[PDB]
Amino acid sequence: NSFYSQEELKKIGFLSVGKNVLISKKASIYNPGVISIGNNVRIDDFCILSGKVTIGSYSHIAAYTALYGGEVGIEMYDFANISSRTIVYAAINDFSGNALMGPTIPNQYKNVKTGKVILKKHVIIGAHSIIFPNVVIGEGVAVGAMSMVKESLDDWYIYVGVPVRKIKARKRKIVELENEFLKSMNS
Template identity: 55%
Template sequence: MLGFYSEEELKKIGFKHIGVNVKISDKSSIYFPETISIGNNVRIDDFCILTGGTSGINIGSYIHIAAFSAIFGSGGGVTLKDFSCLSSRVTLYSLSDDYSGHSLTNPTVPKEFLGVEKGHILIEKHVVIGTNSTVLPGVTIGEGSAIGAHSLVKESLDPWGIYAGTPVRKIKNRKKEILRLEKELKQ
């Protein structure tokens, strides 16, 4: 299919696991694919960056990652559970430099001069993250939550909430109709 890697090309990339009906743009950048697992029915659009690193990335099934999004699993790893979705320009950082001034920053500096924060990011089932949002290390976004555009998520969020802002705050509860739709889809 034009614009997406073929099934044969996906196998050659060397993913830890790759499911069926996976469409990854041939304009995406993939680093350390041997630490990246991808489920079934996944689409990753143009100009996305996936960096598995030592901790890896686990992508479930029925997931869409829109254009220009980035997932950095190098610090503590990243898990996206089934039916989650990243809108365009969403960034998930499982590793972040310490910007307090107590250490140097950036990847050109030797490790002994760096201060970093790292932690696993867990995106539970049915989570939707709006465009231009950022999720920082160690965050869990509870099942069914929706994150508004241009949001900063620096602390874990409860399930079934609608959150927005910098940093995010809960706006209201989210409906659970999607659970019925998931059951219908799987029948």
């Protein structure tokens, strides 16, 4: 394995880091100062966390995943997971041609769309997917592999495609299993 030690970790300088947080040494963490991580979290190789990013507990950010929180930030609630090679954007430039583009160029010439991105509890994003700014992913939502998400998504559904369409209900058993797991944790 490739993860930082508890020793190495406290030395990163996160706004917050819980316990049993496993982080690849091969990930990239920009501005840990604005990054909070709960407990039981895994962040694999070649991830990039940048800007404002909050992660709860029980979350795997699989390899190659980029979270660009910029300023408004990205929030994951507990039991959210993100599969490989996913990108989440809290800010994006305007593609229309009404705006010059990117970090090379002064702000006034651009027309950056920005907006908090939220992943609620039990959201799972499949591999190679893309989430855009200002998007709340509803509790329980499953998004398929190679998905593109530009708009908010209603609780407890499964979505696929570019851009995603609602294809079926997500089952809630998962909520019973969460309840059980916490109780095994209990007494």
